[PDB]
Amino acid sequence: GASQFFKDNCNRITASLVEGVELTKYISDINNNTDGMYVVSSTGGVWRISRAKDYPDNVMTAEMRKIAMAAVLSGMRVNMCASPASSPNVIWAIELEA
Amino acid sequence: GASQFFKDNCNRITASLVEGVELTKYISDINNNTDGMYVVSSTGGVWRISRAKDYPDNVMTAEMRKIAMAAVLSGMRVNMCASPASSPNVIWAIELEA
Amino acid sequence: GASQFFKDNCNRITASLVEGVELTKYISDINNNTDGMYVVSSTGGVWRISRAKDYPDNVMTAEMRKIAMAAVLSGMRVNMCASPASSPNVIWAIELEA
Amino acid sequence: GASQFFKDNCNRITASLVEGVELTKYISDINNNTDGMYVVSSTGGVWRISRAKDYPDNVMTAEMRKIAMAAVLSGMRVNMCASPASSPNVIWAIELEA
Amino acid sequence: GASQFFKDNCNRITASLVEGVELTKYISDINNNTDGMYVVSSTGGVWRISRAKDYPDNVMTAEMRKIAMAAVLSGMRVNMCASPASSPNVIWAIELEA
Ligand code: NA
Ligand code: NA
Numbered sequence: 241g242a243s244q245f246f247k248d249n250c251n252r253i254t255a256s257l258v259e260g261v262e263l264t265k266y267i268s269d270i271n272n273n274t275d276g277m278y279v280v281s282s283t284g285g286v287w288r289i290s291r292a293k294d295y296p297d298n299v300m301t302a303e304m305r306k307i308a309m310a311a312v313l314s315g316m317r318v319n320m321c322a323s324p325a326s327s328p329n330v331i332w333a334i335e336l337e338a
Numbered sequence: 339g340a341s342q343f344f345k346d347n348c349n350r351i352t353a354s355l356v357e358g359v360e361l362t363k364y365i366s367d368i369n370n371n372t373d374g375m376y377v378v379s380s381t382g383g384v385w386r387i388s389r390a391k392d393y394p395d396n397v398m399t400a401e402m403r404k405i406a407m408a409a410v411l412s413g414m415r416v417n418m419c420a421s422p423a424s425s426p427n428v429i430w431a432i433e434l435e436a
Numbered sequence: 437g438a439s440q441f442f443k444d445n446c447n448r449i450t451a452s453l454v455e456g457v458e459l460t461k462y463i464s465d466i467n468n469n470t471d472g473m474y475v476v477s478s479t480g481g482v483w484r485i486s487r488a489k490d491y492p493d494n495v496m497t498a499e500m501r502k503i504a505m506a507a508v509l510s511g512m513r514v515n516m517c518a519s520p521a522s523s524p525n526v527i528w529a530i531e532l533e534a
Numbered sequence: 535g536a537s538q539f540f541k542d543n544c545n546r547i548t549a550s551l552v553e554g555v556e557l558t559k560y561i562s563d564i565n566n567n568t569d570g571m572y573v574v575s576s577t578g579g580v581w582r583i584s585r586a587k588d589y590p591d592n593v594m595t596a597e598m599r600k601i602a603m604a605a606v607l608s609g610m611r612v613n614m615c616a617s618p619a620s621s622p623n624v625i626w627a628i629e630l631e632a
Numbered sequence: 633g634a635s636q637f638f639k640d641n642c643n644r645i646t647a648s649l650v651e652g653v654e655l656t657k658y659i660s661d662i663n664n665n666t667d668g669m670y671v672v673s674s675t676g677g678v679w680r681i682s683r684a685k686d687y688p689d690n691v692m693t694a695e696m697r698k699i700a701m702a703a704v705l706s707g708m709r710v711n712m713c714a715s716p717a718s719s720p721n722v723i724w725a726i727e728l729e730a
Binding site: 540590598 | 655656657658659662663667672678683685701705707
């Protein structure tokens with residue numbers, strides 16, 4: 241049950257809408273090769289959270305990390321818009337649902 | 339119900355007062371043409387949260403994001419003072435109520 | 437009740453001590469004329485939270501906002517040292533109590 | 535009680551190990567000549583939390599603030615390596631305990 | 633247990649995967665010899681959280697510290713990828729598990 245606004249914003253062949261995901265793992269990694277921020281779902285799916293140096297994307301990425309860590313802490317579900325082209329798929333948008 | 343203070347400030351300007359809103363979705367988006375931070379109400383109404391690069395407004399915008407996210411986690415209601423100029427309407431002021 | 441330390445530091449020449457305040461609203465506002473961060477108590481008293489652009493005061497002002505929002509979320513009471521020279525009165529020190 | 539590691543790092547005559555402290559107030563002050571962040575224990579003990587502009591102490595001092603806040607909100611105890619003179623004392627290290 | 637993703641990435645013979653660690657202390661230290669951020673587990677094992685002055689690694693190390701603090705606050709277990717060459721061992725990746 242992603243909002244219709246969230247669905248409308250991720251409605252293209254080059255992006256994957258994924259709905260009602262339970263995230264159960266939140267990962268920070270600064271190892272070589274695998275550095276980044278990730279989440280893993282109850283199913284075992286993995287996404288990478290985008291990072292960005294400057295404004296405005298640095299506001300949105302910081303909020304993606306807060307959404308991700310709140311979902312893992314609370315068990316709230318998220319809906320995601322993600323790039324299918326990248327492995328793990330990179331999150332382009334995320335929706336935290338009560 | 340909105341504080342008299344908050345109602346008076348919103349009544350100064352042409353923006354519209356919205357009371358007792360229950361926010362159920364919080365969105366961060368870095369897609370190409372819908373980038374931003376947004377909230378979705380229990381009735382499906384959508385608003386964008388103000389963005390600002392610089393001081394002092396970036397203080398207030400950061401707190402609007404925290405108020406948004408707290409309302410979504412807690413189910414606390416919010417009152418908004420929202421501009422109709424844009425789609426979705428932009429939150430110019432918000433009040434978290436316990 | 438306010439700590440002796442908090443009370444001793446609130447210089448009565450320049451400010452007044454307010455004890456055992458229950459804050460029930462937290463407001464962020466970016467409108468042109470009512471610009472700022474505020475709190476509203478259970479009795480309708482309003483106060484403006486101080487902001488600063490530079491270190492070190494912006495460490496303290498960030499923590500005033502965290503105390504304010506935590507009090508509204510939790511119902512924990514605060515004590516304030518507030519200047520009466522503006523309306524709303526401005527908070528120059530705040531003490532969150534467990 | 536304090537970890538052996540924490541005790542080991544605070545084992546000198548000029549700083550005191552203080553264990554099982556209940557913090558019940560958390561103060562932000564920007565007033566003339568008392569500005570700073572402080573905590574008050576259940577028995578009336580006062581400490582200033584250190585402040586630092588630059589890396590790496592800006593990381594640790596920000597974490598000391600979050601530890602103090604969390605202790606006040608949760609009632610979790612802390613252990614401190616602190617100065618041994620009259621209140622208010624300074625803090626060299628702080629351990630939040632579950 | 634560790635996600636398959638997490639386990640796959642802790643793949644240097646010089647590194648150690650530790651699973652299902654319950655962290656019970658979170659330390660901020662600004663002493664001269666021992667400055668840093670640490671966690672202590674329910675069995676007394678100690679680790680140092682990595683630090684980084686600059687983007688991008690400072691995004692991940694900030695999230696390491698949020699993961700550690702959340703774990704101590706909630707009792708949620710963590711999985712770590714850590715380096716034995718050090719005393720205390722240094723965390724190069726960490727997975728918070730709901
Ligand atoms: Na006075
Ligand atoms: Na000592």
